[PDB]
């Protein structure tokens, strides 16, 4: 029983080893939008007689 407790403690510290890290690479990314209409700014001014 004493040996079982000693072997258990040793195995516990052997299992305390890291494997990897996982994360997300999202900094710098932004969401795009869509503009449906071209913003022209033209008006036509004509005289009453059309001259």
């Amino acid at each position: 029983e004493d040996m079982a407790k000693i072997y258990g403690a040793v195995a516990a510290v052997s299992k305390n080893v890291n494997s990897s890290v996982t994360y997300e690479v999202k900094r710098g990314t932004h969401e795009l939008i869509k503009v449906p209409t071209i913003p022209h700014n033209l008006v036509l001014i004509q005289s009453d007689n059309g001259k």
Partner: protein, 50 residues
């Protein structure tokens, strides 16, 4: 180095928590010897093991 110190401290706690769970590996007689100064028996064993 910081890594060695951190590794030692974490391992020491893992061992101590294991040897005091269920029926303790260590007898009540030596726990009395290490507690005589007032410290907790679990803490005294950790100091002696180091």
């Amino acid at each position: 180095t910081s890594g060695s110190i951190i590794n030692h401290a974490n391992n020491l706690n893992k061992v101590i928590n294991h040897v005091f769970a269920d029926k303790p590996l260590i007898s009540e007689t030596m726990l009395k010897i290490l507690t005589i100064d007032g410290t907790t028996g679990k803490d005294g064993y950790r100091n002696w093991l180091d």
